[PDB]
Amino acid sequence: SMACLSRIDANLLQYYEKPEPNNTVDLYVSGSEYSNCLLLSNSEYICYHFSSRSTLLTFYPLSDAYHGKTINIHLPNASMNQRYTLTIQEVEQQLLVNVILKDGSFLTLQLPLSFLFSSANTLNGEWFHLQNPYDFTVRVPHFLFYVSPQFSVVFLEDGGLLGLKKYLKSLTRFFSRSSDYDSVISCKLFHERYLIVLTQNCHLKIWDLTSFTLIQDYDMVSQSDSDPVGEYLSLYNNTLVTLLPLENGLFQMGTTFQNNIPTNLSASAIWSIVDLVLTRPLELNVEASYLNLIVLWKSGTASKLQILNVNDESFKNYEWIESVNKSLVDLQSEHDLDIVTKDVERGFCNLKSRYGTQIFERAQQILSENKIIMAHNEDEEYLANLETILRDVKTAFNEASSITLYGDEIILVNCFQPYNHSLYKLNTTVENWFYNMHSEELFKYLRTLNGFASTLSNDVLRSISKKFLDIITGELPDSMTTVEKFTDIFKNCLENQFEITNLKILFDELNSFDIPVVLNDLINNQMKPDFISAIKFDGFTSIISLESLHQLLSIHYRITLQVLLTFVLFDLDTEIFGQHISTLLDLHYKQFLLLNLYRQDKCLLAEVLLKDSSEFSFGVKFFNYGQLIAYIDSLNSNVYNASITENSFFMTFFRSYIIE
């Protein structure tokens, strides 16, 4: 099970030093619970959140969470079935919202596109349509589904439903003369007329109206296979994918035909599906597949994203694709991987930087809610306690609730805390190598290097990396031979014990590679290297680019560091490896600088990077993985091609100031 997707965390207020957005509007009427992302008539993503389980709705543009204005809509009474009795759809340049209150009332909301986008502080007129029509305490609210031309269908647990034309009813009066049971827990609409429904049991009921008509309580599949409210349905084209209860997740695929073979799930602990989406294929290193099924799972805070590849035959065969379910940033803090980062005052500033001020402010408050005070420096006892509260705050913030396709094919996962989203990116070749170093040429070469390098304390790694810097700076006198410099770095940094037994393994393994060749592949192909538009400022897009670039470079820094490491220990011919070495040193110097600018002022770093590569300076628009990867690569190219050489003493000062 190889991992082909990275997780890239977008905190929308992250670049800013002040959460929340400066402009928030509170309209009244009279943590988090669900988050999704709706695409609008103009090309813009608007996000919604529902909190407790009603009494709160909010919106913000995905593109401009900070300067854009989020809209809070308070509610008199909670929704009947929190969030299941909601519908958001866009009609006539107007966001349409409906709800069924615990009162049993029925609410309609009309928010012009114009209102959310404009800066207006508040907007007058009437947007309340409270109605009590067609519902009684007699029959309880349950599920609200949206019908295309503004028509909406409502279910209630007595297996049953009502129609909304506001009150229209379908034919099913079921009276027990012998013997609630069952229920409806999911639905979707085929083509134009047919609403395909699912039961608590679970089985499906098909429709056309033909107001009270159906193929039947196909209770599937009730018999099919094993003999003993959520998103257990996804339908693409004529293809429908249905999820079943056991024993292990059974994914049933049925394709006016209703017929076919289910596929299994991978599992260990207990996972409950968060969302499910069935679409066209994405570029994957695989043989032909005729579909792609994206599945999102969640065990408490932790979420798992998977993709299912399929062959025509709607199952000639199927492959499961995994993904790294934590950011590289996240990983680095846990597994003490980071070498770039550098007194409590400093550590403190570092943390503020590694987390959005949103998270940092939230951790600050909680620590003060629990009476945990600071005594300034060497009050680390205190921070050690904060580092951990940060983690916990972020994992919580990042709890998934829904998946958005930042179409065409991008996978966007929306989290509980507002302004927190997670994009899952397709890995380039170098990223797969890094991520699945354990799964069964170059790859092997890189694998053996990380084997030896893994054995070194971070101090020594940092110690070494700096030395490589000195050479470029020329701090290591230039007159010195490359060999001389390397024997110097050796005696000072590595001379100390590193187990001898390990080094042997290292050397013996290196004798198995045409090294000159795998380097040329690593350096001139793998490591070293048509857009719209980007027009208006964005924002979300800006973050993905910076984080994605960071991940690649960090990955590059580790690899590059290790390759140079080999030259230091066994001095091969400086005669033979000069162009390679010169570049390694040059690249390392460049990588080191970026990963440092990243630590300090990520917001500024993004602007500089996006102004150099942007026709309008606002960046590109991502519609394809291949198009996003392309853009990260150009930024990458832009960085490796930058002129190290310092023009004025100012330039040199700036560089030294970071090399400190």
Curated annotation (Swiss-Prot):
Region (Leucine-zipper 1): 109-130
Modified residues (Phosphothreonine): 357
Keywords: Coiled coil, Membrane, mRNA transport, Nuclear pore complex, Nucleus, Phosphoprotein, Protein transport, Translocation, Transport
GO molecular function term, any single one: structural constituent of nuclear pore
Compartmental location: Nucleus, Nuclear pore complex; Nucleus membrane
Bilayer topology: Peripheral membrane protein
GO biological process terms on file: double-strand break repair; mRNA export from nucleus; mRNA export from nucleus in response to heat stress; negative regulation of transcription by RNA polymerase II; nuclear pore localization; nucleocytoplasmic transport; positive regulation of DNA-templated transcription; positive regulation of transcription by RNA polymerase II
Primary localization class, coarse: nucleus
Cellular-component GO terms for this entry: chromosome, telomeric region; nuclear envelope; nuclear membrane; nuclear pore; nuclear pore outer ring
Described purpose of this protein according to its UniProt entry: Functions as a component of the nuclear pore complex (NPC). NPC components, collectively referred to as nucleoporins (NUPs), can play the role of both NPC structural components and of docking or interaction partners for transiently associated nuclear transport factors. NUP120 is involved in nuclear poly(A)+ RNA and pre-ribosome export, in GSP1 nuclear import, in NPC assembly and distribution, as well as in nuclear envelope organization.
Quaternary structure annotation from Swiss-Prot or TrEMBL: Component of the nuclear pore complex (NPC). NPC constitutes the exclusive means of nucleocytoplasmic transport. NPCs allow the passive diffusion of ions and small molecules and the active, nuclear transport receptor-mediated bidirectional transport of macromolecules such as proteins, RNAs, ribonucleoparticles (RNPs), and ribosomal subunits across the nuclear envelope. Due to its 8-fold rotational symmetry, all subunits are present with 8 copies or multiples thereof.
Name the UniProt record assigns to this protein: Nucleoporin NUP120
